[PDB]
């Protein structure tokens, strides 16, 4: 629906050996694509508890502000030839896109 | 690390009839607990396709300014009685939590 904000995230595991901060740089050249300002990148490592770690090791969280910044994303030749990559470097690819929609914030509730 | 904001996340599954809506009148009032304005919560439903649905139904992204946060939400009885049925509304429960580091945002890559 992209009612407002526009999710991807991404799960993985790795077999070989995912340098995640090597790939941090490509992250660092992925948000190149961000000079349209109208897309976004975060990275994250589990870093808790194996009970609460999911068990992966990590995702990246992926809103852009709304669907031109998705159709931005790949009109590039740098996410391809990273995607590639991206899968020879990971050994489970999981994948959850939804709408978000900037309101849950509501402090007001209903008798 | 809890380096900058700190992130929780749920994913799961309904079997009884998960009424997301219903429970989203308790997130307006989870809400309430924002009165800090040092806590986020959002929601999403499986609006894609089978394949990047990742076959669950929906999930809760709580993300914090930092750690005192996560204390509070916990510190008030809303949260307990809120768990309690969190579960009995569910079929599975799986939650990942990291440290997020606003920063990724660098337009800038070494040679």
């Given at each position: 629906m992209a009612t407002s904000g526009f999710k991807h995230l991404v799960v993985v595991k790795f077999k070989?050996?995912?340098?995640v901060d090597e790939i941090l740089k490509g992250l660092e050249n992925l948000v190149s694509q961000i000079d349209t300002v109208k897309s976004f990148e975060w990275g994250e490592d589990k870093?808790?508890?194996d009970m609460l770690r999911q068990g992966f090791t990590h995702a990246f969280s992926m809103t852009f502000e709304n669907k031109d910044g998705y159709v931005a994303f790949t009109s590039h030749p740098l996410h391809v030839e990273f995607s590639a990559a991206f899968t020879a470097v990971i050994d489970k690819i999981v994948l959850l896109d939804f709408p978000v929609a900037?309101?849950?914030?509501?402090?007001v509730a209903t008798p």
């Open positions: 070989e050996d995912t340098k870093e808790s508890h900037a309101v849950k914030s509501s402090v």
